[PDB]
Amino acid sequence: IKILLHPSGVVERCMVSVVYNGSALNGIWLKNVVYCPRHVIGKFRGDQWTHMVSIADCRDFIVKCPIQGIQLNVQSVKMVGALLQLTVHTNNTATPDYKFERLQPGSSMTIACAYDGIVRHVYHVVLQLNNLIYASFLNGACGSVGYTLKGKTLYLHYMHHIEFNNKTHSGTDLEGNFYGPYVDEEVIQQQTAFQYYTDNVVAQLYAHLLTVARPKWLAQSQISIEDFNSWAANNSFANFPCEQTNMSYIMGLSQTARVPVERILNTIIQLTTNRDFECDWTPEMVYN
Amino acid sequence: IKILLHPSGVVERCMVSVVYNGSALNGIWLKNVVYCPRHVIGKFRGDQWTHMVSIADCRDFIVKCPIQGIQLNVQSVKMVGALLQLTVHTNNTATPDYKFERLQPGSSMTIACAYDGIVRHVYHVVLQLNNLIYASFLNGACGSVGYTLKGKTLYLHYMHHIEFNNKTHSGTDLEGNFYGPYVDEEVIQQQTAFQYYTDNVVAQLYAHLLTVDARPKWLAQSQISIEDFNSWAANNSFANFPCEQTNMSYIMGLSQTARVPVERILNTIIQLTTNRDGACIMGSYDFECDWTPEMVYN
Numbered sequence A: 001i002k003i004l005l006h007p008s009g010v011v012e013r014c015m016v017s018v019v020y021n022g023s024a025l026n027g028i029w030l031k032n033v034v035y036c037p038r039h040v041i042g043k044f045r046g047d048q049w050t051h052m053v054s055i056a057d058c059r060d061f062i063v064k065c066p067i068q069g070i071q072l073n074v075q076s077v078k079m080v081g082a083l084l085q086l087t088v089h090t091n092n093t094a095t096p097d098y099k100f101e102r103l104q105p106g107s108s109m110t111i112a113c114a115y116d117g118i119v120r121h122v123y124h125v126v127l128q129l130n131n132l133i134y135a136s137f138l139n140g141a142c143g144s145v146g147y148t149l150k151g152k153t154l155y156l157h158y159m160h161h162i163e164f165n166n167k168t169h170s171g172t173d174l175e176g177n178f179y180g181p182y183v184d185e186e187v188i189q190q191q192t193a194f195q196y197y198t199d200n201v202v203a204q205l206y207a208h209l210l211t212v213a214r215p216k217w218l219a220q221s222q223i224s225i226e227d228f229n230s231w232a233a234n235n236s237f238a239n240f241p242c243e244q245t246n247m248s249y250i251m252g253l254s255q256t257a258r259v260p261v262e263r264i265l266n267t268i269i270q271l272t273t274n275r276d277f278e279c280d281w282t283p284e285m286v287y288n
Numbered sequence B: 001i002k003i004l005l006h007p008s009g010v011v012e013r014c015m016v017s018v019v020y021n022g023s024a025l026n027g028i029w030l031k032n033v034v035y036c037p038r039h040v041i042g043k044f045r046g047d048q049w050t051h052m053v054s055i056a057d058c059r060d061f062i063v064k065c066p067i068q069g070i071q072l073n074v075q076s077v078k079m080v081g082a083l084l085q086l087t088v089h090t091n092n093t094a095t096p097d098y099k100f101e102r103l104q105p106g107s108s109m110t111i112a113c114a115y116d117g118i119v120r121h122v123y124h125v126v127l128q129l130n131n132l133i134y135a136s137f138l139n140g141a142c143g144s145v146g147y148t149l150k151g152k153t154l155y156l157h158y159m160h161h162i163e164f165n166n167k168t169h170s171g172t173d174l175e176g177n178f179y180g181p182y183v184d185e186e187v188i189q190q191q192t193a194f195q196y197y198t199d200n201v202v203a204q205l206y207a208h209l210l211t212v213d214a215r216p217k218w219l220a221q222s223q224i225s226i227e228d229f230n231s232w233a234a235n236n237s238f239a240n241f242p243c244e245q246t247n248m249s250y251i252m253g254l255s256q257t258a259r260v261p262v263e264r265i266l267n268t269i270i271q272l273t274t275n276r277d278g279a280c281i282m283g284s285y286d287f288e289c290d291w292t293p294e295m296v297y298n
């Protein structure tokens, strides 16, 4: 039982460099459109973006695709949400079947971290209930995408925008809308309190009992799901189950492990003195 | 600080499928040669391989590369170690600058786990001191490769062969020699006892101090010397520290930024074996050998 990531080859063939008057980041090239963060044209705030994008000369958008050796030429600039839709002359012949899918908190995705239009590293994250990811990005990485795959169909979920001072990262879906109440502005932005995605904590504990001698810190007594949820409301744990569809997986793991979920939940409560606690294992990934 | 995988696009463009009389697995296609495990021609033992390979007809090797729409035709077949080197008529246009490099225990690599010539998952493993990897594989995954990337060159380290009862996996390097004393035969094979790669366990705790909590309450207050630790390590399934002298430059740096000398990390490891009591360190619940000092420091 490993943390599984999706192969990045399809994403690599679409990544492009986007350089606008001394500001460099990444973008993705699908059909005849290149999607990049809008702050490549400057550091603006509020409703200045509409007018500021309209005064942007397309000749200044230097766009290159390193994998294909092509230099793209922009014909029109359209702002959609917090993203820029740059229409180019050439259609990307490497464009796959793709979908723009929003992620619900607690779901996983593969980050294709890129620089200068080239994907450098690939790693795994789960969108937390505070609508932040705990990723890793340096200067010039904006425009990196978080994606999943399902039968050679690219599911784009995320594009990176901003890093906060507690090693948190925020971006948009590919429709241009941020996750949570965060924006692309260099100011302090109040984050909602952290809360554990309980379904995923349950998934990690079951992953441990399946890849190891049942440990000593495993609780000996059961607790009802309802008693856990009254406890969870005062200990920053999400109401269980967070996703009703996860019970098909969780109950299946409870069979393979011969440990009922009621015992796993009481173990979560007793591990409070030790208590980040990590919601990186989803029940789908552990079961399949 | 994350577990970083290398981008797999270079590997996908060269993966192929290899089928022989109903036995199907994966192969990698570099230049004019296709490399795949030898048990695609049968489940033979001992020294039966040299003979059975020389009588295998090349017209029974069905070789497709689905990402390029080509079906390959095999000219010659040569057994190199536990691998078959299938020469084909067509040079691979997507062949990168590559190198066959054998890993030493404690190093990491990215696994491109494929089926029918297409990689379905990528994940990260470390060659353990038993010369096994703790990976994830199903039927038809043989031929999957473990690799790393240094700029432009693709560094091939591993090709998958066999899964053992304890969810451990074994294979060869790209030159054809297995890691450890394991062979491609469906019998029980003795495994050396498990031993933690102490350098990597030190890197995991430092990763926790630098990203999760700078002063966790399981961090030992007192220190132990490297020497006193290594006396304890010989009896507690921990390798002698340091396992690699080149890791010291990374660990000394991690100590300087964490403001916690390695002596306290080593004593923390000793204390955790008697009083971890369910502590979850860098999301792992167990000591992991997945975090290397190089990756955590860089």
Ligand SMILES: *C(=N)[C@H](C[C@@H]1CCNC1=O)NC(=O)[C@H](CC(C)C)NC(=O)[C@@H](NC(=O)C(F)(F)F)C(C)(C)C
Pocket (backbone or CB within 6 Å): A024, A025, A039, A043, A136, A137, A138, A139, A140, A141, A142, A143, A161, A162, A163, A164, A165, A169, A184, A185, A186, A187, A188
């Ligand atoms: C995109 N090219 C970068 C990605 C950053 C750089 C450092 N790590 C990352 O993930 N994005 C930016 O540089 C941001 C630009 C804004 C206008 C969208 N700026 C930031 O992320 C800054 N963060 C803040 O000011 C904030 F207060 F925390 F929000 C940096 C990280 C530069 C201080």
Ligand SMILES: *C(=N)[C@H](C[C@@H]1CCNC1=O)NC(=O)[C@H](CC(C)C)NC(=O)[C@@H](NC(=O)C(F)(F)F)C(C)(C)C
Pocket (backbone or CB within 6 Å): B025, B039, B043, B137, B138, B139, B140, B141, B142, B143, B161, B162, B163, B164, B165, B169, B184, B185, B186, B187, B188
């Ligand atoms: C090749 N595609 C597979 C990959 C396996 C299947 C299950 N998980 C894997 O990683 N390799 C095989 O099927 C092996 C073929 C041999 C002849 C090289 N066989 C095995 O791995 C078997 N293992 C054993 O018999 C052994 F005892 F553990 F060594 C299986 C796991 C199928 C029983």
